[PDB]
Structure formats: structure tokens, C-alpha cells
Design a protein around this ligand. Structure first.
Ligand SMILES: C[C@H](CC(=O)O)CC(=O)Nc1nccs1
Lengths: 300, 237
């Protein structure tokens, strides 16, 4: 188990760690998060009490380094940093643990939720979507735009998701206009899976990362990307059976985890009604269809 | 964006544009079968592609053989229309290619957009105008070439005959849409109006009769009366 210590907590803030969250008061003796499960990426995220503008956060993997949080009063945010001195880092954490000034990652043992939401998400792929090569961890916030959003403006602060556009030359083979527009299998299997992502695991990783950024930061371009990646699969007549079964599992846990009161802004009615009831794969998403119908029957 | 009454004069400016109407592409008769089921039989159709400034009409005849062995014909017909309109645009010299293509039915937008990806600077637009181009097959010479076709054929026509020698494009389009609306509303009566007088003839090289300026005024009034008459018959007014 690994640890992300905090130098201090000078401003009141709601802190998230994966799907968990807790409130820290202004100048409260809080010094971080312990017992973080090794083996997964994680996200530590913030929303300031005095300014809910900019949810922001950091994706990280404790296997890649020792990371801590320190508030910057000039830039006005909690920054992640890497400590390269291992002995210094261990000694700091030990003191904070001994004084019981850290919250424990509150994982229930029966509970696979975080694994189910991040099964395909790897840090190395996050660092290609979020480009800041001098850090081993990746900053995301509520306002960052995607490369596709920018094409339709600071490129260094962008989310480089894979561009999906159903009315583009990439999606449509000359001479196969109707075929490729009504059946996106070419675009899914040849252009995207064989060509760009190389395999379905990388495709699902980006889909899962997009969802998590949409959910945790309210990042609108991330929501667009998540829905586009769902729609591309569902609008394909030819999808490997293992991929459809895995998509059903991925979407089921995403819908299960979504806050009930964010469904109006995080779920696109058109995409979901099309995917569940009209698409080639309308009968391939049994678990997702059941949870959607029982939890959000209004959207449908 | 969409084309409506607010930007109606844009049709007659010097930016090349084409209307595309797909109503008459897929045409069928419906009949009972020996077993008492119902079956369709396709008949030849056409794409109606019109330059409203010049009157040039690219009427692509759609021969029934293109439907043979195909499924979902009403959907296929939109894609065939887009396929045919895009090769017409590809075939046209650069300085003749349109800057805008206006489709009369919004279901043509995506098929045409996808077929025209290679032409990102040609705007594909809907219209809020209710245009009566479905009645093109009430023009005898157009109906005749479509029904006589034995293979796909592109036929060229000026739908304004020689009117632009005497009137503006705005007026010619208004006359055309009035004639087509009248033929759409009561075809028999419209043709009666257009031919009633045997001394006015259709030139071999024209579609409509050779009316004088004064006679066109009379004809246009009679067409308006027909449309109003039929509206009264319809709604009991
Ligand atoms: C594809 C089409 C020919 C066909 O439909 O077989 C193209 C065409 O008719 N080009 C023209 N350029 C000037 C006047 S008509």
C-alpha cells in the first residue's frame, strides 16, 4: 500500500481520491491519504470550498514514483509533486502516519468498483492524452478542451483524445459512402482498432479515461469522447463478440457509479437511446440496458 | 444554414447554386398479387437538379434496373441521388461547380454531405421553402424522356425556355414555381389553362408555350385562381 502525503491544507477543499471524497477545513491538520491500493491508476481531485470553479486533479500511479501534494498560494491550487529522495519521503510519511494525520483509502474488501472502472486504463496511455512529459502524473481540470474541440485554444493544455468524426474522410471509404456511414465496422475495426489503437484494450482504456474525466471534473469534451467511442462500437454491425461482452461490463459499472443527480448533464439521450434500442448492438448490452432502465428510465 | 423567405434573393445572386429534389427518384405503383398480397412495381424516376439563376436543369433519369435485387429502396434512393449529384459536381468544370447545393428534403442532407466530403467548400443546405419540384413529371416533355428511357441517361434542359431574354431570374423562378404548384394541385386544370388556346404552341426546343408578355400575365392569374379555387374546394371555404 502506498501513500500521498500533503504538506498542509491551507484552504478549505473537498478532496476526491478515486470514487471517494471528503471535506477538509481551512488550516485543518490534514497530511494526506494512506493505504492506496497498488495495481491501479488513481486520481486525486479537488474542488475548492470558496470557489467551486475549476474542479481539477492528478492522475498517478504509485508504482512510478513517490508523489505528494503541496498548496501553491501564488497559483492558488494544490499541486502534485514528485519527491526523488526516497529516505526523506519515507520519513515524512512515517511521522504523519504515527500522528494519525492521514485518511485511509476506504476500500471495502468485497468491492471491485475501481478495478471495474479502470481495468484498461494505464498511466502510459494517460500521459499521451495529457502531454506534460516532465511529470510522471497528469493534471486534468474541468475546462481543458480536447484536440477535436480546438479544431472546431492553447495546444499545450489540451486533451489529445483520438479524434472520432463520423462524417470525415477517415470514417468513409470513397466508393463505400452509404455502406460506411450506415455500418461503421470499417471505421471501428480497420481505422481505429487495427490502425490507431492497435487493440481493443487500448480503445477501452481511452473510453474509460474519458468517462472518469467527465464524471470527476465535469469535463465536457471528455463526455463527448466517451459517447463517441460507445456510439462507434454500437453503430458497427461487425464487432468481435468478446468486445461486446466487455463493453457491457464496462458501461454497466460506469452507469452504476454515476451520481444519480448528474444524469441530466453526463448522459446523452440520443446516443443512449440509439445504442440500446436502435443500433446493430441493441441486443448485445443486456446488463447495461437493465441498469439504465431501472436507474434512469426517464432518459429513455 | 437553411434557406427561407428572408434570404430568398440569394437564389439569384452570382454564386452558382443548385437545388436538388429527390422526390421522383424512386417511383412505384402498388398492386394486389394473385395470392391477395400487395406488391410494388418500380417505374423510371429522375433527379431534378436545377440552377435557379440560369434555368439549367440536369435531369438524371433513374432507370428501374438500378433497383434490381436491392433492399431498403427508399433509403437507397437518397444515397443514389447523392452519388449521382456528387459525380455531376465532380464532372462539372471547376468554374461551373456550385458553391451551394440546396436540398428540398432534409433527409438528403447526410447522404449528400457524405458523398461531397471531397468538396469541403461546397455548402450543403436545407430549405424552409415548400417547393413544388415533385410536379416536374407533369411537364410533358420531361415525363416523356423519363418513361421512354431504357438505360440510365443524363438529359439537359433549360426550364425557363427563353424567358430570361425578357424577365429576371427572380421573376422566372416565381413563374416556374407558380406553374409547378398549379400542376401539383390540379394537373388537369393546369394543363387545360396552358393549352386551351390552340394558336399558342410549344416550340420544338421549349417546354412551355410561347406566350407573349401580356398572355403570361393572363396565364399567371388563371394559375393563381386555380390554386385558390382548389384551396377553397379542399377546406370548404
Ligand atoms: C455523371 C454525369 C453523367 C451521367 O450521369 O452519366 C455527369 C454529367 O452529366 N456532366 C455534365 N456536365 C455538363 C452537363 S452534364
Amino acid at each position: 500500500m502506498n501513500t500521498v502525503p500533503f504538506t498542509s491544507a491551507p484552504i478549505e477543499v473537498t478532496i476526491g481520491i478515486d470514487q471517494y471524497s471528503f471535506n477538509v477545513k481551512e488550516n485543518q491538520p490534514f497530511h494526506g491519504i494512506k493505504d492506496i491500493p497498488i495495481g491501479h491508476v488513481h486520481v486525486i481531485h479537488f474542488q475548492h470550498a470558496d470557489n467551486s470553479s475549476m474542479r481539477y486533479g492528478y492522475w498517478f500511479d504509485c508504482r512510478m514514483g513517490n508523489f505528494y501534494i503541496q498548496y501553491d498560494p501564488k497559483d492558488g491550487l494544490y499541486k502534485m509533486m514528485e519527491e526523488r529522495d526516497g529516505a526523506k519521503f519515507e520519513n515524512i510519511v512515517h511521522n504523519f502516519k504515527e500522528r494519525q494525520m492521514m485518511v485511509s483509502y476506504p476500500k471495502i474488501d468485497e468491492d471491485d468498483t475501481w478495478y471495474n472502472l479502470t481495468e484498461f486504463v494505464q498511466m502510459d496511455k494517460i500521459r499521451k492524452i495529457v502531454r506534460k512529459d516532465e511529470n510522471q502524473f497528469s493534471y486534468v481540470d474541468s475546462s481543458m478542451t480536447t484536440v477535436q474541440e480546438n479544431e472546431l485554444s492553447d495546444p499545450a493544455h489540451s486533451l489529445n483524445y483520438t479524434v472520432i468524426n463520423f462524417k470525415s474522410r477517415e470514417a468513409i471509404r470513397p466508393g463505400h459512402e452509404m455502406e460506411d456511414f450506415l455500418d461503421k465496422s470499417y471505421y471501428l475495426n480497420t481505422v481505429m482498432l487495427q490502425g490507431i489503437f492497435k487493440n481493443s484494450s487500448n480503445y477501452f482504456g481511452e473510453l474509460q479515461f474519458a468517462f472518469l474525466n467527465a464524471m470527476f471534473f465535469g469535463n465536457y469534451g471528455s463526455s463527448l469522447q466517451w459517447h463517441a467511442m460507445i456510439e462507434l462500437i454500437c453503430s458497427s454491425a461487425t464487432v468481435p463478440k468478446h468486445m461486446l461482452d466487455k463493453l457491457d461490463e464496462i458501461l454497466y459499472y460506469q452507469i452504476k457509479t454515476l451520481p444519480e443527480q448528474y444524469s441530466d448533464i453526463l448522459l446523452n439521450e440520443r446516443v443512449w437511446n440509439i445504442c440500446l434500442y436502435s443500433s446493430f448492438q441493441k441486443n448485445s448490452l443486456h446488463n447495461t440496458e437493465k441498469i439504465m432502465e431501472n436507474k434512469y428510465p426517464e432518459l429513455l | 444554414g437553411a434557406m427561407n423567405s428572408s434570404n430568398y434573393a440569394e437564389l439569384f445572386n452570382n454564386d452558382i447554386k443548385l437545388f436538388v429534389d429527390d422526390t421522383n427518384v424512386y417511383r412505384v405503383t402498388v398492386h394486389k398479387t394473385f395470392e391477395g398480397n400487395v406488391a410494388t412495381k418500380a417505374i423510371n424516376g429522375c433527379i431534378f437538379t436545377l440552377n435557379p439563376k440560369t434555368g439549367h436543369l440536369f435531369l438524371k433519369i433513374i432507370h428501374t434496373s438500378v433497383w434490381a435485387g436491392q433492399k431498403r429502396l427508399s433509403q437507397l434512393a437518397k444515397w443514389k441521388t447523392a452519388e449521382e449529384v456528387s459525380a455531376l459536381v465532380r464532372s462539372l468544370p471547376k468554374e461551373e461547380q456550385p458553391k451551394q447545393i440546396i436540398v428540398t428534403r432534409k433527409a438528403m442532407l447526410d447522404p449528400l454531405e457524405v458523398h461531397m466530403l471531397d468538396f469541403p467548400n461546397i455548402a450543403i443546405r436545407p430549405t424552409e421553402l415548400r417547393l413544388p419540384f415533385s410536379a416536374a413529371m407533369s411537364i410533358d416533355k420531361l415525363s416523356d424522356v423519363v418513361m421512354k428511357a431504357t438505360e440510365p441517361q443524363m438529359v439537359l434542359f433549360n426550364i425557363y425556355d427563353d424567358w430570361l431574354d425578357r424577365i429576371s431570374s427572380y421573376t422566372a423562378f416565381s413563374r416556374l414555381t407558380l406553374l409547378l404548384r398549379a400542376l401539383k394541385t390540379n394537373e388537369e386544370s393546369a394543363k387545360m389553362i396552358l393549352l386551351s388556346d390552340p394558336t399558342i404552341t410549344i416550340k420544338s426546343y421549349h417546354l412551355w408555350p410561347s406566350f407573349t408578355d401580356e398572355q403570361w400575365i393572363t396565364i399567371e392569374s388563371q394559375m393563381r385562381d386555380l390554386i385558390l379555387t382548389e384551396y377553397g374546394r379542399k377546406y370548404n371555404v
